[PDB]
Design an enzyme around this catalytic site. Structure first.
Site: not given
Lengths: 189, 293, 49
Positions: A27, A29-32
């Site tokens: 999550f 890594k996806l938000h970054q």
């Protein structure tokens, strides 16, 4: 109802991190590496969710757009750590589309933040606001609201989600720059 | 013939502690004077490790002695069980070398599994290994830990050279001292994970560090012949092969994959098991521990 | 006397001083790995010591 472009994410079981730890890493890594340059269409619901056993996340399901996944999965903010989990696949949207409006929002969790707000811009009694924090005062997500937190505060992850009602209806809304819904989301099924 | 009432095996593959420091990427060629990661405090009290403001690269350095003599116990009551065990392990050593187990140990050195949660989401991690015979590098290896996998085992040329070196060290053909450096990429001032003490982070004279038994656990992570599932990849070699974070335990004495049952059948009753199970048994003997009733 | 501290070492030496006053009257220097551990074999300075 509007989960046309569908995808999944399965973090494999390994002794190098927990399933909640792997979900929080995915999550973050996806938000970054998804809302880094911005974007509009990002839907991240629980594709293997079960909110009855108190476990907020143990599987990932993405219900996003075509161009939002053709350019939102080819960066180093998403790749690199693909040795635990795996990649995804595209799937069409069927006729069965429940209006599960998944969101990315917050909840009430401050047991002394009202005292800080009254001291800053309220002019309230800070002693009564500090002593008015009982166990029956906090009203947060008692269901599985998985809070993938960072290494800044020692307090554990509380609820941070905007879940919707699972029925046979339709409810879609505007996606933010973090993979959520601001009034509804795509389907789940 | 019966079991020896006291067995004790000294461990092989003896590592030193991990001296974590920090620096900036593409200055790794002079990474001797890099400042250490200092354990500090913030908030109740917690201990937090971070990076410097103009640093984005971890450096984890330790040494590794490979001893050899991997069958002889350090304490044994019986004199018939002892040389029976010696000739059984000698049969294992002469019908095939240590090169399989040593290949898997050189693979665990080849990637960066001794980085535990400072690997997850890294941009580039390189594992440098030097060979030390005197105070001078006799052979220098360089790797790439994201290219080499974590759930499968592959082949190379430099990995086979390192595995040949480890296999010569485990048999007693020479003295092997290797120093291991793992550069990494996290970010400009992010958080690193040391090992926690009985929160308190483990330290030495003003440097955060990792326990040596943790790196030793990350080196004996070999056995893929627990035949239940390859989705978990390999696990740690230990009798009653169990994971405490998973909470479950495969390789039970319910079935006959146990170290104790296989060791009893292959030493006492001469029941030679499959080759993979005896790889597991010799890996437990390289691990060491307190055996016997 | 190096019990486990010589098991798997590069080089082990034992140098021995003879002390009469606060002064080394006679010094020795050995190679503990070249000298064995199973047999008792003769040498010149070993016979002096």
């Amino acid at each position: 109802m509007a989960m046309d472009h569908y995808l999944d994410i399965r973090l494999r079981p390994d002794p190098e991190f927990p399933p909640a730890q792997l979900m929080s890493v995915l999550f973050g890594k996806l938000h970054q590496a998804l809302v880094a340059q911005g974007g509009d269409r990002i839907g991240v619901s629980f594709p293997d969710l079960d909110e009855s056993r108190s476990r907020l996340g143990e599987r990932l399901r993405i219900h996003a757009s075509a161009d939002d996944l053709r350019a939102l999965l080819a960066r180093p903010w998403l790749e690199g750590l693909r040795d635990h989990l795996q990649f995804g696949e595209p799937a069409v949207v069927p006729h069965p589309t429940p209006y599960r409006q998944v969101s990315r929002v917050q909840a009430k969790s401050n047991p002394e933040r009202l005292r800080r707000r009254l001291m800053r811009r309220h002019d309230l009694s800070e002693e009564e606001a500090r002593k008015r924090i009982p166990d029956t005062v906090a009203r947060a997500l008692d269901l599985p609201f998985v809070t993938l937190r960072s290494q800044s505060t020692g307090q554990h992850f509380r609820l941070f989600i905007r879940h919707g009602p699972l029925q046979v209806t339709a409810e879609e809304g505007g996606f933010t720059c973090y993979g959520l819904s601001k009034g509804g989301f795509v389907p789940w099924f | 013939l019966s079991t020896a009432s006291v067995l004790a095996f000294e461990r092989k593959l003896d590592p030193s502690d991990a001296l974590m420091s920090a620096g900036a990427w593409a200055q790794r060629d002079a990474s001797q004077e890099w400042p250490a990661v200092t354990v500090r405090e913030k908030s109740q009290t917690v201990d937090v490790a971070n990076l410097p403001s103009d640093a984005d690269t971890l450096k984890v350095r330790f040494t590794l002695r490979v001893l050899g003599g991997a069958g002889t116990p350090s304490a044994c009551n019986d004199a018939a069980y002892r040389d029976k065990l010696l000739q059984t392990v000698a049969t294992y050593v002469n019908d095939q070398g240590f090169a399989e187990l040593a290949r898997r140990y050189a693979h665990n050195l080849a990637n960066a599994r001794f980085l535990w949660r400072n690997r997850v989401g890294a941009e580039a991690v390189e594992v440098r290994i030097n060979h030390i015979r005197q105070g001078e590098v006799a052979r220098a290896w360089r790797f790439d830990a994201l290219a080499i996998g974590l759930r499968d085992f592959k082949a190379d040329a430099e990995l086979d050279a390192l595995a040949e070196l480890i296999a010569s060290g485990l048999s007693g053909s020479g003295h092997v001292l290797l120093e291991v450096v793992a550069f990494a990429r996290i970010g400009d001032g992010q958080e690193v994970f040391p090992s926690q003490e009985l929160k308190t982070l483990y330290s030495v004279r003003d440097a955060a560090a990792i326990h040596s038994q943790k790196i030793g656990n990350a080196l004996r992570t070999i056995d893929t012949w627990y035949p239940d599932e390859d989705g978990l990849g390999p696990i740690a070699v230990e009798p009653y092969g169990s994971v405490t974070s998973q909470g479950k335990a495969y390789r039970q004495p319910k079935q006959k994959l146990d170290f104790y049952t296989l060791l009893d059948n292959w030493v006492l009753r001469d029941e030679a098991p499959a080759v993979e199970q005896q790889h597991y048994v010799i890996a437990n003997l390289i691990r060491g521990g307190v055996f016997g009733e």
